[model samples]
Target chain A: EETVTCLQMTVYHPGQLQCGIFQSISFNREKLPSSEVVKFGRNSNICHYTFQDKQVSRVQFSLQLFKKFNSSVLSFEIKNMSKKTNLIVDSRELGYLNKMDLPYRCMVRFGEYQFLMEKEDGESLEFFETQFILSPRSLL
Target chain B: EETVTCLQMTVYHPGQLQCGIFQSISFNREKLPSSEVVKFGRNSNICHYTFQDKQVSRVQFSLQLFKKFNSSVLSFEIKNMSKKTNLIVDSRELGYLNKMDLPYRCMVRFGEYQFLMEKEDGESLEFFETQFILSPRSLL
Candidate 1:
């Protein structure tokens, strides 16, 4: 199966006073169960992905696009989506579009697919930042 | 003056570095120059604010509500809005809303104002993260 660009994600936990993780791994959406599909919101840039990981935990990721504000953010839900399985997210990193200011141009190579992150004059600043959390259980 | 709750904000750099700031100052929108007012876009949660701080810099904070995406993100323009004066945002602290899936509640007191942060059931999660650059001059 083809791989997807691991969009770098950062997980945080203020309780342990730890800055969490800065990690990523190349993963293939195709390798996931057929029931797990990455889909965008109707008429929106909002997209989501959920899948069973080693029958441990169900991992979900939500993405939002702030078209006018010129900013975007994503969230991760890593927990049990079902009683029969638990979720495990190997990487804290996912996706591309790593830019903070505009006139932004970047190419992300995910397996055989190439995606370009480009912005223009009307949009001069493409700020990029991510926030996530790993279940206390998942960390171990 | 009563002490208002501090808004928690996290700043991230591309180097997998994150600066978590639990900060809030006695900031009053009223104290902001009258010329600089808080404005919201019609039929939108898109809000923008601009003000100048004599001790440091003039600042602008833009808020975008990705309504359909069920998420929102904000950005700070901590630079001079005019050639006449430069605005520096000393602290990156900002926000509203709360969610259990997220460590979400933060109260922001901008002077006499008390902002309550609350979220609903349909609102799955509200992820908050920020990115900003301070003027080299203001750092002094």
Candidate 2:
């Protein structure tokens, strides 16, 4: 059986009033095939994912899945679609129209929004498991 | 005045017996220049940086600074020189002889070592200021 690839994204709004507010979304290769690109921004009509903030561009960025040449392995690539705003993927600034391959786990930042993305395989349930600890420092 | 670019690398040994052991090295464009590639690995003579670990290849990887066309901004690019061991730059795997642009800050892992690299500017001391807190979680 072919392994299913999942791109899990956690969007966090870092504004003073909106701090600690976040949302999660997962994109799978099965639901959205390699042929279709996943666009995200403030525009709801054209974007698969939309942000409510005005600072976000109407069409900010896009993600697409691609297969490695002569290999069964699949990976996702990200493109900066916005002309004015720059996208920071893992501290690497991506200019307009520039595209790059997404790492297995990375943090993307733009404006007041921060996105944490992690790639997981369907068979690797144990790898995705997490244990959380709550402490005073974490609360502060 | 031309801005000075510095690449600071912190190498950590994550072996069972050597956990929490680390060292740091900094490479500046003024000393290394854009023309000279900074090579690192087990070999001391040819490598600008050397590792003591036996698992590390004689010539594992190289870093070079390059100026963007028509732009004075210089950025560093990394090349994988090892044929057998794979390199993980911020969770993105690089195969043999492949090269990619290094981000402003990234974690590179190969074999039993982890390297944290951060790009800095000489005039931007405020941006590089960091405050640390000692916590139990950090100790653990």
Candidate 3:
């Protein structure tokens, strides 16, 4: 089994709270699973694996209509990274004005995986935040 | 006028790198213009808006996406925000996989966007260390 670059995907449940990042682990064209792949990596947190090559101001962090799962998943592989990483958070100058702007709350965790949020009270989780431990532009 | 929550979205484009994020002020669905009647706001940077809600994350930020335009436009409204805001990198923990993990490089960015990579001298960005940055999780 080889690693494939995970694409960013988003799925909305009509009137839902929001969407999160997810990976396309499997898919189908006519009937069987999809074998088309790009970029490569093992651990699916692709945000860090991307943006390794340049000073880009444009980022594609989501996929529409490729919903194998209910949530959107994106996976990328940095060529050969170790102890350091770079993220390209374009400074608003490069984005267009009429296109669909995927809204997001941005932050990066330092260690561990497996995160869970509960729906306290009658209302579902409307929003949340995190610390900016590092910036993609500042990362080396 | 009142405080509302934020929204996150993601999309993936194939080749072109042209993207725009506009805020549609009003939506009179039953009206003749349907979409044209709505007012639009200045385009903003999409990356600064996507924040990490998990624990000890590297960075976090958010933006209000006006939805009167189109669902194709990943739009949302930001509640409880400042009038004179300059995109503050927020700090909180409320999303999936919320823990202190090292190598803060798993949560990949996705959706409603395109990608452009930087190349090196006579190379395909394959052998350049500046091409890919992977965080080695040693702190955990």
Candidate 4:
């Protein structure tokens, strides 16, 4: 089967908020929605954006929200779309955005490994949560 | 390595809810909280149950919310402690309590397949999400 990947974009200022469901791992700044990406943060305000990929179903599952910089977490739940099927449930990641001191056209890398399996008698699926951290590498 | 398992027990009521931290996979009913297991469901107004043993950590890392039945799920996250390395990040299950017409002491079977890996290189952890839903075969 073709490799299916679920992307989560976590932008950091101080504490972090995540937005997921990007079809492609690499893209330029203008590719994102101007209305969606706006200034947001609890402590340090920075550019934050929110969007639901109607083209692809938004993925949702249960997990506890961890306290900032701490392993301890609180149980919290949130989601979008009821009929959404988490096909990419096989693989997922936090497509991260960093506030680096560089041009928006530069290149960087983001990745992590994943473990996925359905049953003992079933075949397993494994992959890397790799994404090209592309920024403006040249003069605007 | 020996198989390690984590159990998640979800008890559902009208508003109040509970989740349990698991260190092992199998146990007797006496092993759980008695106060927590009052008969429940639409008729009893007590508690009902449902569960899935993620032999594979089926724990794909992503975020989204899917709606089901009458219950509202709050996202809660937890992992094994330092002393307890989660080799069993391998498979985890939620043993549930619910209203059924049968005797309190009955039997059940639960199962699923899973795949658990240490790193992206080669070692893979795989198993079926399975549980013999057997409960107390006798009365207290």
Candidate 5:
């Protein structure tokens, strides 16, 4: 099967997504509609965004979201199922943006490792509840 | 690595859940705190009900609740990452009784194959912000 990829052009946010091991999530932020990149923080067990999608980029699947900066904001839970991983998107205290546009992009890279983060724009958001292409399983 | 999944069930309606690829969904008129083995559209979408849990059974990623069951619904873009697969728990459509005690058992199935879905419950009304678990890669 082709390598799992993050179809950066298509970003999605769900309230419940099943990965059989760990779940990836993105909250619908009203404040930053066009903001594609997010800094993931796994320090205080508060905020983080491990890059996921078709990439199969990293190993761990742990993550969390904080509502306020420096403050513990309970948003979502992400239980990593791997042993060789750190964070996903960006550690607000670290990470940065990479590309922007219809599919905004961001990254959380350290040493030779990096995570790609992207989002859908206003137009793409329309596709949220319309038609869902039948998902296909990968061989890898 | 395990597989990713969406949810499904037997017995269903057009408003709350428009029977799609799930295996089956139940439709009940009286509030029976008891569980019912719902039926699915001839072509339902759920596949992993036998080995799933009731708590996390509610996925963290759901579809943009606002855009569900409309014939006008279009198609979806794929990513290895999770996105709102379909319907968002709409009480009105669910025919749920006792607003205080929701039919927490409601769910939809999801997976890489549109044909193989998991269970997404009816209780997760809000976004999972802040508090969450980060496990290793999903094993489902």
Candidate 6:
């Protein structure tokens, strides 16, 4: 059995008057091999996904794809790599060096940035076809 | 008609070997008055609810009760007071000075702390009667 796994991360800058999306990145299994780890942090040189906040560590966290033992299902696991800051995923805290398996959808928060991570499987265009319509209140 | 409102916040410390609850607080309409603001942050002397982490601002955020116009129903409004850290409420980023109405249940995240806010109404004892059974995985 074969599956297409897609992970999308949308970053937002809190407290800014703009209140608009700061950046977004998408990783697909077709581009990233299984077991390859993706790093995120403030230093673009070391992190595949980077933030501009100084409070964010050079390498804040890492996410890696894995296949379930004896099963064809693919999953992701996240680890908190920062020594000074903690990562909040789906309201659960991931302290320094702590790791956990990621669900299909979750919110990751650190410092002044918020990352919305969503995983999509199968051949459906549902994930890429999704549209975001900003409300009038958000524009204020 | 009058309604009794309760807001409960449960805090957790990520990465600690204990993996137990760090603190918990409950605020209710019976004890707090409407329009009165309740402050939260790292400073115990100034904050109504305090945290021990230095990453948390001196006065991080605030919650206030408000009555709907021409109605007896009550709702909560939260504002991000931290100038350095951004607050994540129910996956939405609230930057400094940004305010929004809270839903019946929401997750608030800042720094390394995770606060689960649950609101309950009516005369039922459902809120107080809730029990938490820790799984073996959590104890490990």
- Model 3 misplaced regions, further than 4 Å: A6-69, A75-140, B1-55, B64-67, B70-140
Please identify model 5 stretches exceeding 4 Å from their true place.
A1-84, A92-103, A116-140, B1-140
Per model, the share of native interface contacts recovered reads: 0.00, 0.00, 0.00, 0.00, 0.00, 0.00
Writing each residue's lDDT as its tens digit, candidate 3 over B1-140 gives: 22222111222233213222212112211111111111112322322222221211222222222222232222322221212222211232223212121111222222222112221222111111112212222211
lDDT of all the models against the reference? 0.24, 0.60, 0.21, 0.21, 0.25, 0.59
Candidate 4, A56-115: lDDT as tens digits? 222222111211222121111122222223212212221111111111122211112111
- lDDT measured at residue B115 in model 5 versus the true structure, 0 to 100: 23
Each candidate's DockQ score against the native complex?
0.02, 0.02, 0.02, 0.03, 0.01, 0.01
TM-score of each: 0.22, 0.41, 0.16, 0.19, 0.24, 0.40
TM-score of model 6 (first chain only): 0.72
Q: Poorest 10 consecutive residues of model 5 chain B by lDDT?
A: B93-102
Question: Cα miss at B130, model 5 (Å)?
Answer: 26
DockQ, cand. 4 = 0.03
In model 2, the runs with Cα more than 4 Å from the true position are A16-30, A122-140, B1-140
iRMS, model 1 (angstroms) = 11.3
Cα lDDT of model 5 by residue, A49-110, tens digit: 43434323332332222122232211222222222343344443211111111213554333
lDDT of 1 at B1: 34
For model 1, residues B21-106, the per-residue Cα lDDT tens digits are 21222133222211121331111232233222222122222232222112332211111122222222233232211111212343
TM-score of 5: 0.24
TM-score preference between candidates 1 and 4, better one: 1
Q: Write the per-residue lDDT of candidate 2 for residues A35-97, one digit (tens) a residue.
A: 345777877787777666667787788775544434345567777767679888997998765
iRMSD per prediction, in order: 11.3, 8.0, 8.0, 15.6, 15.3, 21.7
| Best model number under TM-score | 2
